[PDB]
């Protein structure tokens, strides 16, 4: 009864991308059941807006109790910032993965220098309307979160202001890719399994992977409503242990063929396994005359990366997401300063539960010693010191503060 979950049921949402792997694998390989969570429903969300709506509603209303999220969605939902004032407190419990994301660009931009560092192509992009009849058009999957941040960082590092120099919009992924085929979309912030299809089907090329923009960067996370977690503490830790074991399992190369087979199944991603076999080996055809990537360390990682533990949710990473939100002037009234950002993080990030769950499960040797992963370094040399986010913001060339 000590480890017995208060309830064996929970509804967790996911989006059909590699970031969802730990949830799918924990369920399909019996890791959730091992700890008593035999009633986990891994529910596919139609899109990010729908996932947001479903967690706001909650399972009792026909929605979800938590799930996979781009950052800082849990924080924004907790503060009612993206729910029209409906504050639904949530807890960030674990990071699901790092990498497995990238930026794609249309073929018409090849030989223009639109690669990892777009500095030399800045003027080309900025004057696209006069030369090509329209503003450079790029898209993400939901505003103010991960993909938006990745493409914005990429543009801004090369001298392109994502708010004034281009048309950065939120567009469905299928509509976005179709746009690239039609010659109306110039680039988009995506992730696996999308890159493979884009390059193999000559829809475009890969300007760069997020693994190149910020090696081992924080990515998507598991977050559950605070009311559910507060009511079911034992069940919450059981879920964490199941996820941790699944992450460890996924990172063993020997299990990746099965991982790919399972997630690509009809009842999940529903896509040909061939489009994910390469990424899970760290293999990517970049195109545009650039060398292909062949490095396991540059593909998706779920348990351990080159810096620290992937799963442990470092508060310094929540801090970067809120600091970058401030950089772009997002939620000007709700998050007006870094102090407010830290207060939100202390209410949302529950790294303490991750530590507790890891300890009980026997993973003490993998627990990071600090809540900070230290100074972070981006591909353009900019560094983020969690101890001084103000200095990070001031070191950036393009920003709204
Ligand atoms: Ca992502």
Swiss-Prot record:
Part of the ABC transporter complex CmpABCD involved in bicarbonate transport. Binds bicarbonate with high affinity. Induction: By carbon dioxide-limited conditions, probably via CmpR. Keywords: Cell inner membrane, Cell membrane, Ion transport, Membrane, Signal, Transport. Its main location: membrane. Predicted to be exported by the Tat system. The position of the signal peptide cleavage has not been experimentally proven. GO terms for biological process: cellular response to sulfate starvation; monoatomic ion transport. GO terms for cellular component: plasma membrane. It holds the Pfam family NMT1_2. The complex is composed of two ATP-binding proteins (CmpC and CmpD), a transmembrane protein (CmpB) and a solute-binding protein (CmpA). The keyword Ion transport applies. It is found in: Cell inner membrane. This is Bicarbonate-binding protein CmpA. Belongs to the CmpA/NrtA family. It is a peripheral membrane protein.
